[PDB]
C-alpha cells in the first residue's frame with residue numbers, strides 16, 4: 001500500500017498549502033511576538049519609577065471608572081520594578097464600540113502610560129503584532145468561522161505528517177522538487193508536533209482534549225466545566241480582584257505553588273476568577289487557580305507539572321508550539337520551522353503547477 005499513501009499526500013499537502021503557508025510564515029514573525037512589540041511599541045514597556053505597587057483591584061478601579069463603559073477581565077500584574085501592568089477590557093453594553101481596549105498602567109501611580117485597541121489592521125506601531133497574532137490562527141475571519149478552518153488545516157497537516165513519517169521510515173522543476181524532497185524523515189518529524197500543537201491551540205475542547213482522553217483522562221477546564229453548567233446555578237458575582245488575590249495566595253500556600261501571582265482573570269459568562277502564577281518567559285512553570293464568583297471557593301487548579309498525563313500533555317502544547325520548551329534556542333528553532341513550512345507549502349504547490357504545465 002505505497003501509492004495509496006502517495007496520492008493521500010498530494011491531495012492533503014495541497015489543500016493545506018496556502019493556509020499552512022500564511023500560518024507558518026506569520027508564526028515565524030510571532031516567534032518574537034513579545035519582543036517585536038517592545039521594539040515597535042516602547043511606551044507599553046516603561047520603567048515604573050516607584051516603590052510600593054497598589055493592589056490589583058486598585059489598578060482595576062482606575063481603569064473601570066476612567067472608562068465608565070468598559071470592564072477589566074484580564075490583567076497582568078507586575079512586580080513594580082518592571083513592565084507596565086496590562087489591563088484588558090470589554091464593552092459593558094454587550095456590542096458597543098470602544099476607541100481603546102487594552103490599558104497600560106504604572107503599577108505605582110495608576111496613571112495611564114499607553115493604550116491600544118486590539119487587532120486593527122496591520123497598523124505598524126500597535127495593531128501589527130496583535131493582528132499578525134490573531135490572523136495567524138484565524139485568518140481574521142468572522143469568528144470561530146475559520147478558527148475552525150485553521151484548526152482543521154492543522155488536523156490534516158498532522159495526519160499528513162504521520163503518513164509521511166511511515167511512507168519515509170525504514171531546471172525549475174529539477175530544483176523545486178529537489179529542495180522540497182530534501183526534508184526527509186528528520187523534517188517530517190519536526191513538522192509533526194507543530195501541527196499537533198496547532199490542533200491543541202485552536203480546537204482544544206473540540207478535537208484534541210477529547211482525543212487525548214482516550215489515552216489519559218483530561219479533566220475539562222473550569223471554563224469548559226462552567227460553559228456546560230445550567231445557567232441558573234452559576235450564582236452572582238461577589239468577589240473582586242483583591243479578594244481573589246488573597247484567596248489564591250491562601251490556596252497557593254497549601255498546594256506549594258511556588259511562583260508569584262502575575263495574571264488575574266474574571267469571566268462574566270460563568271462567574272469565576274483566575275489567579276495565574278509565573279511569567280510569560282517560562283510558560284512551563286505557570287500555574288492557575290480558579291475561584292467561584294460567589295463563594296470564593298476553589299473551583300479548579302492547574303498547578304504546572306502536576307495532574308494526569310493527558311492534562312500536563314495538554315499544558316505542554318503551548319510551550320512546544322512557541323519553542324519555549326527549548327529556551328531561546330527553541331524559539332529560534334520554531335522561527336526557522338515556520339519559514340521551512342512556508343518554503344514547503346510553496347515548493348510543493350509549484351511541483352503541482354509545473355506538473356500541470358504539461359497540459360497547458
Ligand code: HEM
Nearest residue numbers: 010013014016017020181183184187188344345348349352
Ligand atoms: C517535510 C517533509 C515533506 C516531505 C518529505 C515531502 C515530500 C513530498 C514529495 C517527495 C513530494 C513528491 C511529489 C510526487 O511524488 O508526486 C511531495 C509533494 C507535495 N508535497 Fe510534500 N513533503 C513534505 C512536506 C510538505 C508540506 C509541509 C506540504 C504542504 C504544506 C507539502 C506539500 C506537497 C504538495 C502540495 C505536493 C504536491 C505535489 C503534487 O501535487 O503532485 N509537502 N511532497
Ligand code: HEM
Nearest residue numbers: 023024027030031133137150151154198201322337338341
Ligand atoms: C507554520 C507552522 C506554525 C508555526 C511555526 C507557528 C508558530 C507559532 C508561534 C511561534 C506562536 C507563538 C507562541 C508564543 O507566543 O509563545 C504561535 C501562536 C499560535 N499558533 Fe501557531 N504556528 C504554526 C502553525 C499554526 C497553525 C497551523 C495553527 C492553527 C492552524 C496555529 C495556531 C496558533 C495559535 C492559536 C496561536 C496562539 C496565538 C495567540 O495567542 O493569539 N499555528 N504560532
Ligand SMILES: CCCCCCCCCCO[C@@H]1O[C@H](CO)[C@@H](O[C@H]2O[C@H](CO)[C@@H](O)[C@H](O)[C@H]2O)[C@H](O)[C@H]1O
Nearest residue numbers: 155205206207208209210211212213214217218219220
Ligand atoms: C471532521 C472533524 C474530525 C473530529 C475528530 C475529533 C473528534 C473526537 C471525538 C471523540 O469522541 C469523544 O470521546 C471522549 C471520551 O473519551 C469525550 O471527551 C469528553 O470526555 C472525556 C472524559 O471521558 C473528557 O476529555 C471531557 O470531559 C470530554 O471532552 C467526547 O465527548 C467525545 O467527543
Ligand SMILES: [Zn+2]
Nearest residue numbers: 033034280281
Ligand atoms: Zn507571549
Ligand SMILES: [Zn+2]
Nearest residue numbers: 034038083281
Ligand atoms: Zn518582557
